[PDB]
PDB file of C-alpha atoms in Angstrom:
ATOM      1  CA  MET A   1      -6.728 158.607 115.912  1.00  0.00           C
ATOM      2  CA  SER A   2      -5.672 162.553 117.204  1.00  0.00           C
ATOM      3  CA  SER A   3      -7.371 164.894 114.910  1.00  0.00           C
ATOM      4  CA  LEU A   4     -10.319 163.375 115.148  1.00  0.00           C
ATOM      5  CA  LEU A   5     -10.783 163.274 119.315  1.00  0.00           C
ATOM      6  CA  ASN A   6      -8.923 167.015 119.269  1.00  0.00           C
ATOM      7  CA  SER A   7     -11.853 167.514 117.011  1.00  0.00           C
ATOM      8  CA  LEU A   8     -14.371 167.290 119.970  1.00  0.00           C
ATOM      9  CA  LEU A   9     -13.045 170.408 122.670  1.00  0.00           C
ATOM     10  CA  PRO A  10     -14.689 173.092 122.331  1.00  0.00           C
ATOM     11  CA  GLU A  11     -12.947 176.478 120.112  1.00  0.00           C
ATOM     12  CA  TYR A  12     -12.158 178.501 122.536  1.00  0.00           C
ATOM     13  CA  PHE A  13     -10.662 175.909 125.347  1.00  0.00           C
ATOM     14  CA  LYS A  14      -6.730 175.183 124.178  1.00  0.00           C
ATOM     15  CA  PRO A  15      -5.687 173.193 126.956  1.00  0.00           C
ATOM     16  CA  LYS A  16      -1.786 173.402 127.704  1.00  0.00           C
ATOM     17  CA  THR A  17       0.939 170.428 128.277  1.00  0.00           C
ATOM     18  CA  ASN A  18       1.089 168.571 131.773  1.00  0.00           C
ATOM     19  CA  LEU A  19      -1.971 167.530 134.896  1.00  0.00           C
ATOM     20  CA  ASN A  20      -1.148 166.793 138.279  1.00  0.00           C
ATOM     21  CA  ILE A  21      -3.951 164.585 138.766  1.00  0.00           C
ATOM     22  CA  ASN A  22      -3.820 163.437 142.922  1.00  0.00           C
ATOM     23  CA  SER A  23      -7.396 162.711 143.049  1.00  0.00           C
ATOM     24  CA  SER A  24     -10.014 158.857 141.534  1.00  0.00           C
ATOM     25  CA  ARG A  25     -12.098 162.438 140.877  1.00  0.00           C
ATOM     26  CA  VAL A  26     -12.611 165.734 138.321  1.00  0.00           C
ATOM     27  CA  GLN A  27     -15.340 168.070 138.037  1.00  0.00           C
ATOM     28  CA  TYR A  28     -14.551 170.234 134.861  1.00  0.00           C
ATOM     29  CA  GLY A  29     -16.998 172.239 132.978  1.00  0.00           C
ATOM     30  CA  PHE A  30     -17.625 176.378 132.224  1.00  0.00           C
ATOM     31  CA  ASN A  31     -17.974 180.000 133.900  1.00  0.00           C
ATOM     32  CA  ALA A  32     -20.515 181.592 131.620  1.00  0.00           C
ATOM     33  CA  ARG A  33     -22.416 185.165 132.515  1.00  0.00           C
ATOM     34  CA  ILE A  34     -26.460 184.043 131.870  1.00  0.00           C
ATOM     35  CA  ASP A  35     -28.528 188.049 130.344  1.00  0.00           C
ATOM     36  CA  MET A  36     -32.720 186.561 130.932  1.00  0.00           C
ATOM     37  CA  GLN A  37     -35.519 189.045 130.496  1.00  0.00           C
ATOM     38  CA  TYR A  38     -39.063 188.821 131.753  1.00  0.00           C
ATOM     39  CA  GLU A  39     -42.107 189.458 130.412  1.00  0.00           C
ATOM     40  CA  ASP A  40     -45.973 188.113 131.591  1.00  0.00           C
ATOM     41  CA  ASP A  41     -49.312 190.055 131.855  1.00  0.00           C
ATOM     42  CA  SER A  42     -48.298 191.162 135.406  1.00  0.00           C
ATOM     43  CA  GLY A  43     -45.498 193.800 133.155  1.00  0.00           C
ATOM     44  CA  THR A  44     -41.743 193.302 132.763  1.00  0.00           C
ATOM     45  CA  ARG A  45     -38.751 192.555 134.927  1.00  0.00           C
ATOM     46  CA  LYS A  46     -35.008 191.823 133.921  1.00  0.00           C
ATOM     47  CA  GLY A  47     -31.854 190.591 135.344  1.00  0.00           C
ATOM     48  CA  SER A  48     -27.909 189.069 135.154  1.00  0.00           C
ATOM     49  CA  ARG A  49     -26.563 186.355 136.423  1.00  0.00           C
ATOM     50  CA  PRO A  50     -22.806 187.338 136.509  1.00  0.00           C
TER      51      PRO A  50
ATOM     52  CA  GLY B   1     -39.747 207.492 147.088  1.00  0.00           C
ATOM     53  CA  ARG B   2     -40.990 211.115 145.650  1.00  0.00           C
ATOM     54  CA  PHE B   3     -40.871 215.058 147.887  1.00  0.00           C
ATOM     55  CA  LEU B   4     -43.567 217.391 147.301  1.00  0.00           C
ATOM     56  CA  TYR B   5     -43.691 220.885 147.633  1.00  0.00           C
ATOM     57  CA  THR B   6     -47.294 220.886 150.447  1.00  0.00           C
ATOM     58  CA  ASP B   7     -44.381 218.691 153.079  1.00  0.00           C
ATOM     59  CA  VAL B   8     -43.462 222.356 153.765  1.00  0.00           C
ATOM     60  CA  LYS B   9     -46.649 222.600 155.344  1.00  0.00           C
ATOM     61  CA  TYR B  10     -46.617 226.858 154.714  1.00  0.00           C
ATOM     62  CA  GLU B  11     -48.989 228.188 152.029  1.00  0.00           C
ATOM     63  CA  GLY B  12     -47.508 231.652 151.781  1.00  0.00           C
ATOM     64  CA  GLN B  13     -43.841 233.045 151.045  1.00  0.00           C
ATOM     65  CA  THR B  14     -41.023 231.833 152.189  1.00  0.00           C
ATOM     66  CA  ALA B  15     -36.854 231.004 152.060  1.00  0.00           C
ATOM     67  CA  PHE B  16     -34.994 228.275 153.023  1.00  0.00           C
ATOM     68  CA  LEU B  17     -32.276 227.303 155.301  1.00  0.00           C
ATOM     69  CA  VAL B  18     -30.957 224.071 154.124  1.00  0.00           C
ATOM     70  CA  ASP B  19     -28.365 222.401 156.581  1.00  0.00           C
ATOM     71  CA  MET B  20     -25.500 220.439 154.410  1.00  0.00           C
ATOM     72  CA  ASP B  21     -22.647 218.947 157.127  1.00  0.00           C
ATOM     73  CA  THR B  22     -25.852 216.915 158.393  1.00  0.00           C
ATOM     74  CA  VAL B  23     -26.577 215.391 154.970  1.00  0.00           C
ATOM     75  CA  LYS B  24     -27.106 211.481 156.179  1.00  0.00           C
ATOM     76  CA  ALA B  25     -27.124 208.607 154.425  1.00  0.00           C
ATOM     77  CA  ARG B  26     -29.872 206.410 153.761  1.00  0.00           C
ATOM     78  CA  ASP B  27     -29.761 204.521 150.979  1.00  0.00           C
ATOM     79  CA  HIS B  28     -26.618 205.038 148.589  1.00  0.00           C
ATOM     80  CA  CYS B  29     -25.916 204.368 144.702  1.00  0.00           C
ATOM     81  CA  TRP B  30     -22.470 204.287 143.433  1.00  0.00           C
ATOM     82  CA  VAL B  31     -24.516 207.632 142.067  1.00  0.00           C
ATOM     83  CA  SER B  32     -25.484 209.146 145.046  1.00  0.00           C
ATOM     84  CA  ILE B  33     -22.307 212.650 146.621  1.00  0.00           C
ATOM     85  CA  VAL B  34     -22.628 214.082 149.150  1.00  0.00           C
ATOM     86  CA  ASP B  35     -20.613 217.471 148.461  1.00  0.00           C
ATOM     87  CA  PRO B  36     -22.511 219.387 145.030  1.00  0.00           C
ATOM     88  CA  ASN B  37     -20.505 221.272 143.099  1.00  0.00           C
ATOM     89  CA  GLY B  38     -22.276 224.350 140.412  1.00  0.00           C
ATOM     90  CA  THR B  39     -24.231 222.873 138.380  1.00  0.00           C
ATOM     91  CA  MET B  40     -25.951 219.892 138.903  1.00  0.00           C
ATOM     92  CA  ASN B  41     -28.073 217.635 136.412  1.00  0.00           C
ATOM     93  CA  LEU B  42     -29.630 214.245 137.459  1.00  0.00           C
ATOM     94  CA  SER B  43     -30.731 212.398 133.951  1.00  0.00           C
ATOM     95  CA  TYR B  44     -32.284 209.230 135.376  1.00  0.00           C
ATOM     96  CA  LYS B  45     -35.263 206.458 133.008  1.00  0.00           C
ATOM     97  CA  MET B  46     -37.207 204.327 135.016  1.00  0.00           C
ATOM     98  CA  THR B  47     -38.282 200.565 132.585  1.00  0.00           C
ATOM     99  CA  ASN B  48     -39.226 197.459 133.588  1.00  0.00           C
ATOM    100  CA  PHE B  49     -42.473 197.954 135.971  1.00  0.00           C
ATOM    101  CA  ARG B  50     -44.559 194.939 137.379  1.00  0.00           C
TER     102      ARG B  50
ATOM    103  CA  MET C   1     -69.746 200.904 134.210  1.00  0.00           C
ATOM    104  CA  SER C   2     -67.135 198.534 133.871  1.00  0.00           C
ATOM    105  CA  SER C   3     -65.170 199.734 130.466  1.00  0.00           C
ATOM    106  CA  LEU C   4     -64.758 203.387 131.778  1.00  0.00           C
ATOM    107  CA  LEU C   5     -63.060 202.049 135.165  1.00  0.00           C
ATOM    108  CA  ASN C   6     -60.952 199.287 133.431  1.00  0.00           C
ATOM    109  CA  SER C   7     -59.423 201.983 131.622  1.00  0.00           C
ATOM    110  CA  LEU C   8     -57.893 203.435 134.669  1.00  0.00           C
ATOM    111  CA  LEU C   9     -56.225 200.979 134.594  1.00  0.00           C
ATOM    112  CA  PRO C  10     -52.141 200.378 133.553  1.00  0.00           C
ATOM    113  CA  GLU C  11     -51.449 199.410 129.378  1.00  0.00           C
ATOM    114  CA  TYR C  12     -48.851 196.377 131.499  1.00  0.00           C
ATOM    115  CA  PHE C  13     -51.594 195.297 134.428  1.00  0.00           C
ATOM    116  CA  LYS C  14     -53.690 193.115 133.983  1.00  0.00           C
ATOM    117  CA  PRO C  15     -55.137 191.674 137.197  1.00  0.00           C
ATOM    118  CA  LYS C  16     -56.481 187.451 137.091  1.00  0.00           C
ATOM    119  CA  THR C  17     -60.562 186.727 138.161  1.00  0.00           C
ATOM    120  CA  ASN C  18     -60.955 186.600 142.348  1.00  0.00           C
ATOM    121  CA  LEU C  19     -58.477 187.569 145.372  1.00  0.00           C
ATOM    122  CA  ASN C  20     -59.339 186.513 148.199  1.00  0.00           C
ATOM    123  CA  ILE C  21     -58.109 189.754 150.848  1.00  0.00           C
ATOM    124  CA  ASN C  22     -57.981 188.926 154.918  1.00  0.00           C
ATOM    125  CA  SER C  23     -57.108 191.844 156.185  1.00  0.00           C
ATOM    126  CA  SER C  24     -57.704 196.524 156.974  1.00  0.00           C
ATOM    127  CA  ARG C  25     -55.487 196.990 154.639  1.00  0.00           C
ATOM    128  CA  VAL C  26     -53.668 196.617 151.596  1.00  0.00           C
ATOM    129  CA  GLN C  27     -50.677 198.002 150.009  1.00  0.00           C
ATOM    130  CA  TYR C  28     -50.500 198.133 146.116  1.00  0.00           C
ATOM    131  CA  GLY C  29     -47.879 199.485 143.664  1.00  0.00           C
ATOM    132  CA  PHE C  30     -44.847 198.495 141.528  1.00  0.00           C
ATOM    133  CA  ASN C  31     -41.514 197.278 141.171  1.00  0.00           C
ATOM    134  CA  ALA C  32     -39.307 199.253 138.798  1.00  0.00           C
ATOM    135  CA  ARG C  33     -35.804 200.091 137.231  1.00  0.00           C
ATOM    136  CA  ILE C  34     -34.124 203.366 137.732  1.00  0.00           C
ATOM    137  CA  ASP C  35     -31.136 204.312 135.436  1.00  0.00           C
ATOM    138  CA  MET C  36     -29.635 208.202 137.270  1.00  0.00           C
ATOM    139  CA  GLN C  37     -27.041 210.229 135.601  1.00  0.00           C
ATOM    140  CA  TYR C  38     -25.581 212.716 137.967  1.00  0.00           C
ATOM    141  CA  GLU C  39     -23.131 215.091 135.980  1.00  0.00           C
ATOM    142  CA  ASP C  40     -22.111 218.711 138.276  1.00  0.00           C
ATOM    143  CA  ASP C  41     -18.357 221.257 138.273  1.00  0.00           C
ATOM    144  CA  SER C  42     -16.375 218.313 140.205  1.00  0.00           C
ATOM    145  CA  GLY C  43     -16.711 215.681 137.570  1.00  0.00           C
ATOM    146  CA  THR C  44     -19.202 212.279 136.213  1.00  0.00           C
ATOM    147  CA  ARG C  45     -21.486 209.863 138.176  1.00  0.00           C
ATOM    148  CA  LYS C  46     -23.646 206.786 136.687  1.00  0.00           C
ATOM    149  CA  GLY C  47     -25.358 204.561 138.519  1.00  0.00           C
ATOM    150  CA  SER C  48     -28.289 201.963 139.112  1.00  0.00           C
ATOM    151  CA  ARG C  49     -30.935 201.496 142.135  1.00  0.00           C
ATOM    152  CA  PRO C  50     -32.402 197.608 140.596  1.00  0.00           C
TER     153      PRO C  50
END
């Protein structure tokens, strides 16, 4: 059931036709950007994981 | 990391001769320039105290 | 006079009960973030001290 399992993939990702698998192990993920903001009794601190 | 006028170490009136050729680069952000030209405007904001 | 001297501390800082002093010298300060913006006759330059 193609239309069922095709819906599970995320909206941003649309994969191409071919895939040359040449191993018994494949990592899959995404490269996201995190913008953290910290606050406590001592004070405030702002950072960013690129 | 600030400059007070008392670092001159001379009460009274004087005129200063600034050496513009021997301007060393100790700590450089992207803002940092060596050659100023005309009317210099610097606008800074301090946030995230801890 | 606790309430008088307690007011002098900055609004962001609220210190904890104990402090194990183990020397004859203590530095105290804050880690701030500076967002500088420069403009002169040559052009504009924008930086940030993290």
